[PDB]
Write a protein that binds this DNA or RNA. Structure first.
Lengths: 68, 96, 100, 55, 171
RNA sequence: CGGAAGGGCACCACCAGGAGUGGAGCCUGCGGCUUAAUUUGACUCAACACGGGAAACCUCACCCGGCCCGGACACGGACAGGAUUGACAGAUUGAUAGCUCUUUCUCGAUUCCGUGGGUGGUGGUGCAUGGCCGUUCUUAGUUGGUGGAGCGAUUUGUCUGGUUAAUUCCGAUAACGAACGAGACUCUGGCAUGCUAACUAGUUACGCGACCCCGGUCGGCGUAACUUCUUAGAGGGACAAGUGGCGUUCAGCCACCCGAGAUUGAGCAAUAACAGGUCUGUGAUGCCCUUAGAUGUCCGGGGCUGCACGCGCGCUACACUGACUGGCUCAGCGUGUGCCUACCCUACGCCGGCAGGCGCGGGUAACCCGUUGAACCCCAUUCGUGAUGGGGAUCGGGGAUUGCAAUUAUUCCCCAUGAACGAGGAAUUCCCAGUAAGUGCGGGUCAUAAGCUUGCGUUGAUUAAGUCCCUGCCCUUUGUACACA
């Protein structure tokens, strides 16, 4: 049957080209600079970066929040 | 059915160490009653065995609450090619 | 040394044959044996509808399951009791052996 | 979450937590002596269980 | 037992065990000629004779389906390793078995033999095997949409009383 | 089929009565009305406390909104420069659903987008069905083989007469040999002082201990025998056996001595049929419909209870043959700790009037509840014919139990308010012996729960041993212009 209220669309996945390129900062010597904070959790030691939002930092799958 | 790779390998390893496998008709189960070591939910077990059944690799039976699967030789060869195991070791249902 | 045998069964004459065989075995092995004591029977009563739906005259079933239980005491060691109870068993009678 | 609301219902009681062990329906359950099955399948399989109409 | 179940629940659970086991082997050994089971419980072991017609067809490839059925019972009923044993045995004088002739007749009708010829063949086979009487009632839709029920009865056949419980066989 | 004749049978029929319904209140179901929904099947016996249907969730099939794919598998694209899940913050939302909107972290080939296709459906179809149940039909009817009558459908056997609950037999007979049903069968109940047995039951005698004046009581303890009381096994006992009458002196009927019964009740129950109910019992199933904004499934709430009305099954009363208060005294069917299952029956001691709460115990059951100390009934005061101390509808305040959640009072208890109802019209239901009826106790529905149903126990009658008068059924004959009769 015909409807009046429009349906709610699916959340379109915003794809990110080369998401690892936005993590580190490269130098001409043999060193790297880490922009985003690593998560200090036990299940994710050092290989997992955290989200760099505009006001506070957050790690998703362990749900760890750092506010200012 | 997006499944964990660890649970998929565990259910296929149980299906390879014994070809016939049972399951309980209940979607709302946290853990499988036979393999209580891993997570392995019963809905994942039923849908993985239904995916094996729909392409004709296993035999289906039912007794009032429980789905029974009899693994055939084509399923033996498919699990061997999937797990990359040598053909010398055999499942326990052909043991004598 | 006072070892207790509980005989639970659904059928009547098969249980009678089993307990008579136990009596004859105890009499041939010549030990102090008490009489077989009859516990009172139990009639499991189920009253349901004959009709799958509820359309028609109100009829009711009487499903009756009659279970029976006897006990036999023996003044003998455990090897004699296991030797008697390991011979001539049939599916109609369940045997429970209590040491104390 | 979906995992937090897919099984948020307490099934510790009621006639919908229990069901038949043949049909898995929620009507006419014989919970007596641990049968846990409907009366139609009980009438169907009473000869296999052992219940007989004596009187 | 550590949980200490009652005997009232125990005999009922044994009856449900026999009913579910009978239905499972009826649905699973239908094409091979299933006719019954007989179970024996001993200390630490549980023997069971499957009573069927085609023993080679119920064993398969050197007891493979028998080992599959032992694994079915072991996985579903929680039995320990090697605590249950199955043995297939051939039905003597299978023409008197009512459910074997019933499964033969439904597989004939599934293969595509006609109803009248199939009932004549079943009745002739059981009267050659030697029986007191028969009652072959095939109910369903025949030669159209209206339900037409047939009935092929000859010989002595009792219907009422206590002898109908264990003097005839109904399938 | 006959408001045609001749017989027999039936308290789902009558006579004679007994208890009732229809009169009042309440509960449940149905129709109708209203509503987003008041989900739906069934409409005479054979629908209407029926679907085990005593629904806050679930059941739920209905409505209002929101998740998810649990769309397998195959084909064509996308992709490791990443196919696609999960994610607390702030707005939204109902929820601490990333369900969405702005910002980004994470999952790792399981997945996504289209085309075929499958699964699921308490969706429709019981006029497609299978199975089950009910009914025709609790009555005694039904069918081959051979032979006979008739061209044939058909008839005899399958009955003139007697008898029986019965096509049950006697006996004539174009019939003979037979078959299903009935009968026969199984179980339940009293008869056993005889057998088998008993420390999961008792009896008799003692050893004591307590009390009263040698004797009496003690479920207070233990033991030398036993099963009489308790239980369950083999049995036996009743068969018209005997006598007196009626009757072809056959089939059978009545009374009576002896005797526990000289007709206990239930189950099964023939051929053939129902356009009976069930697709809402099934992963029993055919056809049609939906299948991603779902008729799949889950969550939150409501509803299935709604109220100017009528009908059906039940409960309470209309009272002195009764109400209230104390004292006394008697059972058996039974049930009891769960695969998931998260939920058992309770002894005893304290807190409280109460519902109940707290602790250790017992019990997987003749061990513990429990000698199952249940009601009517028995005895003694209060009442005095007043809608009164009958009755408890309605309604307010409060306290606890079960559950995540009681509001539309889940249930239980305390106080208070105190309606109709003065034995009920036409009409109608059930029944004749431990029967009706009064009365209470168990199981199912159950977490909380019986105004229902099925079993069991106590007290326990009036009236009848007949009939086709009414309502129907079964044989014979007759008539038919009916054969969805």
């Amino acid at each position: 049957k015909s409807y009046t209220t429009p349906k709610k669309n699916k959340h379109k996945r915003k794809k990110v080209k080369l998401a690892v390129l936005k993590y580190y900062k490269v130098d001409e010597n043999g060193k790297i600079s880490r922009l985003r904070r690593e998560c200090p959790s036990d299940e994710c030691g050092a290989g997992v970066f955290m989200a760099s939002h505009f006001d506070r930092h957050y790690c998703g799958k362990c749900c760890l929040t750092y506010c200012f | 059915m997006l499944m964990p790779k660890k649970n998929r390998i565990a259910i296929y390893e149980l299906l390879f160490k014994e070809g016939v496998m049972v399951a309980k008709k209940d979607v709302h189960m946290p853990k499988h009653p036979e393999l209580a070591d891993k997570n392995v939910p019963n809905l994942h077990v039923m849908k993985a065995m239904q995916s094996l059944k729909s392409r004709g690799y296993v035999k289906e039976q039912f007794a009032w609450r429980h789905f029974y699967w009899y693994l055939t030789n084509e399923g033996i060869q498919y699990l061997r090619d999937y797990l990359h195991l040598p053909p010398e070791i055999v499942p326990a249902t052909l043991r004598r | 040394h006072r070892i207790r045998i509980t005989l639970t069964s659904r059928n009547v004459k098969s249980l009678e044959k089993v307990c008579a065989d136990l009596i004859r075995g105890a009499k041939e092995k010549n030990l102090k044996v008490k009489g077989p004591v009859r516990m009172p029977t139990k009639t499991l009563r189920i009253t349901t509808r004959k009709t799958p739906c509820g359309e028609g005259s109100k009829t009711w079933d009487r499903f009756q399951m009659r279970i029976h239980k006897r006990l036999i005491d023996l003044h003998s060691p455990s090897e004699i009791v296991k030797q008697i109870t390991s011979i001539s068993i049939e599916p109609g009678v369940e045997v429970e052996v209590t040491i104390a | 979450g979906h995992q937090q609301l897919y099984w948020s219902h307490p099934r510790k009681f009621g006639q919908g937590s229990r069901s038949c062990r043949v049909c898995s329906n929620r009507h006419g359950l014989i919970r007596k002596y641990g049968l846990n099955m409907c009366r139609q399948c009980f009438r169907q399989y009473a000869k296999d269980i052992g219940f007989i109409k004596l009187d | 037992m550590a949980v200490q179940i009652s005997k009232k629940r125990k005999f009922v659970a044994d009856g449900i065990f026999k009913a579910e086991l009978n239905e499972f082997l009826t649905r699973e050994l239908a094409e091979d000629g299933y006719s019954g089971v007989e179970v024996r419980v001993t200390p630490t072991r549980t023997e069971i004779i499957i009573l069927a017609t085609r023993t080679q067809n119920v064993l398969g490839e050197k007891g493979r389906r028998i080992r599959e059925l032992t694994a079915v019972v072991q996985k579903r009923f929680g039995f320990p390793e090697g605590s249950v044993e199955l043995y297939a045995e051939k039905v003597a004088t299978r023409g008197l078995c009512a459910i074997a002739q019933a499964e033969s007749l439904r597989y004939k009708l599934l293969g595509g033999l006609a109803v009248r010829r199939a009932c004549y063949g079943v009745l002739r086979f059981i009267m050659e095997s030697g029986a007191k009487g028969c009652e072959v009632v095939v109910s369903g839709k025949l030669r159209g949409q209206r339900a037409k029920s047939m009935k092929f009865v000859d010989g002595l056949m009792i219907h009422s009383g206590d002898p109908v419980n264990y003097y005839v066989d109904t399938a």
